[PDB]
Amino acid sequence: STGSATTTPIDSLDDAYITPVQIGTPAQTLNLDFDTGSSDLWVFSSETTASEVDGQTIYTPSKSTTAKLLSGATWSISYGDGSSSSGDVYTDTVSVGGLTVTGQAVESAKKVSSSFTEDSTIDGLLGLAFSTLNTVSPTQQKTFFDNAKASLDSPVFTADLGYHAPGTYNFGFIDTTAYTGSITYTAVSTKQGFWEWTSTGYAVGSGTFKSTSIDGIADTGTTLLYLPATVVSAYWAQVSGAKSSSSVGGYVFPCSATLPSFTFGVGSARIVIPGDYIDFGPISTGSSSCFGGIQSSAGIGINIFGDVALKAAFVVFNGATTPTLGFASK
Ligand SMILES: NCc1ccc(C(F)(F)F)cc1
Numbered sequence: 137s138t139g140s141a142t143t144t145p146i147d148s149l150d151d152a153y154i155t156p157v158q159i160g161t162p163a164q165t166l167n168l169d170f171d172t173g174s175s176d177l178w179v180f181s182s183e184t185t186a187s188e189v190d191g192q193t194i195y196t197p198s199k200s201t202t203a204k205l206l207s208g209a210t211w212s213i214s215y216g217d218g219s220s221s222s223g224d225v226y227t228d229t230v231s232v233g234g235l236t237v238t239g240q241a242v243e244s245a246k247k248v249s250s251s252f253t254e255d256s257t258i259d260g261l262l263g264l265a266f267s268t269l270n271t272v273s274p275t276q277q278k279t280f281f282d283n284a285k286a287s288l289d290s291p292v293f294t295a296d297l298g299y300h301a302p303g304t305y306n307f308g309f310i311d312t313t314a315y316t317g318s319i320t321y322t323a324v325s326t327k328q329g330f331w332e333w334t335s336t337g338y339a340v341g342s343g344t345f346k347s348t349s350i351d352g353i354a355d356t357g358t359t360l361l362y363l364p365a366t367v368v369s370a371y372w373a374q375v376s377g378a379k380s381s382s383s384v385g386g387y388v389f390p391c392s393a394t395l396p397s398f399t400f401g402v403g404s405a406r407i408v409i410p411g412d413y414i415d416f417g418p419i420s421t422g423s424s425s426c427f428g429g430i431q432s433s434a435g436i437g438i439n440i441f442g443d444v445a446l447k448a449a450f451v452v453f454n455g456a457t458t459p460t461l462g463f464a465s466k
Pocket residue numbers: 171172173174215216217355356357358436438440
């Protein structure tokens with residue numbers, strides 16, 4: 137079987153993407169943020185503290201004839217930006233784009249941090265990293281992808297994110313009309329639970345390609361591109377007037393400048409990020425300083441190929457017994 141669903145930017149900067157997901161019987165449709173950097177499926181629900189909910193669609197397990205409380209199970213998660221949430225656990229039917237899993241763990245938020253509450257367009261997260269990162273206790277739970285793997289035609293999903301435009305998540309098949317050229321595959325380490333891979337180098341604008349190993353994760357759940365300080369300094373040095381700002385928390389640049397592209401290596405292939413993708417607009421309304429889409433990973437501890445990078449490519453997440461990541465130009 138296969139599934140296919142459209143994913144839509146939540147705002148005009150592509151800060152995140154939401155995908156409709158059907159939970160329960162009869163279906164309750166929630167717009168979830170598909171996150172290959174985490175492994176929990178959690179939703180705003182009828183059990184979330186009423187003050188922590190501001191326009192989200194909530195899952196109501198009591199209206200689902202297929203929902204079952206997973207007695208005694210709890211979950212608690214903290215994200216790399218300081219976000220957190222926690223609650224209890226149901227199992228229920230979950231469908232994405234026509235692909236249905238029965239008995240999926242649905243983590244119901246009783247508490248959410250403030251940054252989820254302020255984001256009225258996101259009803260929850262759908263984790264697509266490896267199930268070893270799932271936070272359910274005492275019994276760890278499988279991700280939607282892991283549950284679906286058996287019945288998929290091919291154990292893969294693909295991410296085709298749009299620039300200021302809708303895109304597609306496909307499960308179980310590779311759409312050979314959605315990319316150009318060949319797909320280059322590259323090895324994945326699952327030892328930390330992430331889709332972790334090694335990029336072979338980079339170039340700034342039309343400069344020479346520097347061969348150098350950059351280990352990092354493919355994370356649809358992270359907006360920006362976080363790379364080592366040496367790389368990020370070499371990029372912003374080519375933008376007149378760019379500087380690292382401690383009050384803003386990263387590199388900013390004059391909104392009037394034009395940004396060079398950024399190339400990253402996948403084996404012998406090259407993925408080019410157009411400079412326009414790196415502009416995240418004014419730091420405050422009316423400001424002439426603009427926020428850069430490439431930032432240093434030094435304070436994070438791991439390099440992250442977030443949406444800025446991934447939306448420049450067609451990306452294959454191959455969850456075969458030896459996993460790989462595939463990249464193609466589009
Ligand atoms: N998208 C989920 C996520 C968030 C943060 C991190 C970090 F910061 F731990 F690398 C990984 C994955």
